[PDB]
Amino acid sequence: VAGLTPCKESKGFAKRQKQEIKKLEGRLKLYAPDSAPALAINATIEKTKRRFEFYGNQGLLCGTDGLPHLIVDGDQAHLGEFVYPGLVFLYIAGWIGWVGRAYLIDVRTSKKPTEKEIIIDVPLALRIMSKGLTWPVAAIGELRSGKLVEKSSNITVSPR
């Protein structure tokens, strides 16, 4: 796909694993083998070897630079590069957008609506932050019932 070799069989990706441990191994040569800063570089090497063995096992595509490239078209092999964490993101981002929208409706029908935005009512906030879990069923539910959008006759419009 797109002229990119897989990273498990890429010679450039294995070259970057070789020259990263060798950079960290030469950093280890000036420390005692049981010393505290040498345990951090030894944990860095095992973090590096975990990283390169994770990138090759996920079917990542590596170019001529030896670097893993993401295919965001919507490929059946490449769902976890953009499509799977994008749907994970939009669920979380729609959770932020739904509990901030539902908080403003809950404080617009209050005695002092502007004091509830500088001082956020946490019992009112936390009872709808739980309610933002099921938000695609509540956003399209408000879209189908007409409560999501406001009619243009009740919207402040600058003159022509």
Partner: protein
Amino acid sequence: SRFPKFSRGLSQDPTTRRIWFGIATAHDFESHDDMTEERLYQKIFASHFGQLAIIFLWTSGNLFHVAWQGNFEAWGQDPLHVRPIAHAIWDPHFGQPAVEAFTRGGASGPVNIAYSGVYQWWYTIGLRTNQDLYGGSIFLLFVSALFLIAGWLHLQPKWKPSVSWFKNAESRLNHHLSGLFGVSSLAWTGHLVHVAIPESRGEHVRWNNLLTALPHPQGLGPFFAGQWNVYAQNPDSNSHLFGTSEGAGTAILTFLGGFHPQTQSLWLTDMAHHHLAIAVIFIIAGHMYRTNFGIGHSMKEILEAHTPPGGRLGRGHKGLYDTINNSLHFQLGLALASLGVITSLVAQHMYSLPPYAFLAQDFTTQAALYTHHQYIAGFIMTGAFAHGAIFFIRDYNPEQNKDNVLARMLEHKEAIISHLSWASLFLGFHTLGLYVHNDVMLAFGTPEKQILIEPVFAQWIQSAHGKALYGFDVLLSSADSPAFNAGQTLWLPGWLDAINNNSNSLFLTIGPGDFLVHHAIALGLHTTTLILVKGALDARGSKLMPDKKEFGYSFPCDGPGRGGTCDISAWDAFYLAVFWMLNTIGWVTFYWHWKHITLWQGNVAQFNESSTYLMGWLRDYLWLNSSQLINGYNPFGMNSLSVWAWMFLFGHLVWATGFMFLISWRGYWQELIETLAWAHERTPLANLVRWKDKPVALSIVQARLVGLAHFSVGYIFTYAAFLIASTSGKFG
């Protein structure tokens, strides 16, 4: 009635502002006093003639300097190892190192090397000697003189044309499409066939042997008998050397496609056929509208009849013909929108498909010629949008445009501005977050942790063009598509050989850095469009100030009340979007010059590894290519890039000087000039000298314009210097 005489209200100004604004309101003809329709259109018509005369008197001096002080014949003998000379230098401030260092191209003195691609152009078109360029310079002196005579003539009352002649859009479009775009491209084709193709094939065709040198072995027989393929019978082979008779063909109108293999440039037989095609189709398209003969179209009834019956476009385009025809700013904005989209189509198609001989090999000339048309196009497009704003203030009638598409743009203008705002914010967070993320991963020792996105949509389009590098194999890269089998005998043997080559710039191999900077480009166009659509649609008024139309176009502000109304005008949105076009085209030409400056010396892996993060842009492009730029002059000595080393520093002056007008504002300088006026009025021997203009500070609109123009001059000179010193000193 002092200067300025066109505005009575500025003539009674007793300050220096009268001197300033009369320069800047000089061509705003419709804002003048005692000013009418006929004088508007006739002064604009004679100003067009003066503009044509300036363009032709410019080309005449760019031809005269090549013919006189340039080695055009020596460049014609060897276009690969001779630098093209623009003009000689006579500077009284040179020392002997500067005279000895600016002497290039085998000249007798200090000369300037031409990076405008006029030698490549005049070579491809047929001009060979200095006498031909001199004759062209005299001919265009005569043409500019004729346009000055015609400009003076149409201001005489015998030859003054009325506004009904000026607003005749149908006759203007018929004679523009038929004459300007059709008979000039057919005239061209007659040149390219009569002169440029035989001068590419060694035959010297001039005016003395125009009627004797037959362009084809059987000329004008197979044309009128229908067998046009005789004109595509014997094309130029791949062993053809340009300008020589050996290896050449006899066909004048081929359809080969691709590039000439020695020049890496387009075939003159293809460009001749290209012009015969954009000549037949423009003369045929110029018989469209109704002028004098019963047949044709009335564009008023075309726009009236183009209403969707569901009411989604309202009244459609009803009332738009009078809206364009009465508003000169609508026509000028449409012309500049089309001109920006084609000056950018010029820039995109003369680097990838070089049209002139030995232009692809001359690298810094190609870099200049891309940056030229991308900056001239980012000022022409912003002028289009600014003229849309001036149309909405001083030319848009809401009564005449009642519920049409143009009124409905004002009806949903907050949706357009807010969705351009969302798209700009999306592109900005995503492009900045991915570049900053890739910066952090190269900083943290882990290049593999970058989010690198292969631009598979544009790579799929390149494989749809015929690039077999990515292996998509859909159409024109696979032999099983009907488009390939319809093209593989017709143009694709040239095109696939041109696009599968990796040394040229035809549809380059793109990567994750190309993806990221294309989102930078989309950020730049989207945010410039955001500010400009916001200026054009909030031109008449807004929720902060509903009477912006009654304050004119370029008014400074509306006062500190209602929170503060700084930069509220539509001119100020144009002002803020000149910075955004400068940033946009800076990103575009940074990407062009670094994608090409790594292509030309071979190591495209430097761009493929370093363009994904901004420290590669700072270090491997802005710092690495500036090695021989700022070493153009040293304490030890000075090189031939020294003028480009001064012009770089000069840009850093003028740009930063703009900050003085863009940060510091008026009343500080007004009290400063008040103290200066006291000091001059009380100093002995200097109090005797008076001013007639009262010294004032620069006014607020003038301050934004002066800072913007300084910002733009510094921005174009810092990059013209860096770009013409980091490619011409390290060729490759």
